[PDB]
Symmetry: C2
Subunit: 89 residues, 2 copies
Amino acid sequence: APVLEIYQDIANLTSRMLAAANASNWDLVLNHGQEYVCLVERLRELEPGEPLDEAARGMKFDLLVRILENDAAVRDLALPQLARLSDLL
Amino acid sequence: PVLEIYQDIANLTSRMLAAANASNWDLVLNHGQEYVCLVERLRELDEAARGMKFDLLVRILENDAAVRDLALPQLARLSDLL
């Protein structure tokens, strides 16, 4: 199904964001957010419904766990550096 | 159901957005423990229910992005100084 295509793309994009965050390329991470918002809008046009196939349910669930884990991992790379540097100024 | 989890992750992300707005990065970071725990608790539906879940998801997705959009330009410009 096609809505599975957008979850995949968001997972791929969030993995790219993670790679940038890993390299401390904050501006790239932000630049990836532009696509991210596009992808969420497109997601929003397909969803919700109609129900999903059991096979395609566990796949989306996985994709989500991955998107959320990526989102958490970006924050967990960036924020300790932000906190630290903020403390200084 | 699994809506509970989704609800809890959405709510938490709202508290993180509120903290972010206030520049309390430590507090954003402390809730991040709670998020991850809820996310891993996930690794583990009628139409009204799927509309509900989908709504929560969009909110979580928007919230993560809203926090990055606050946090990262500050970080970009502070690493550059230092």
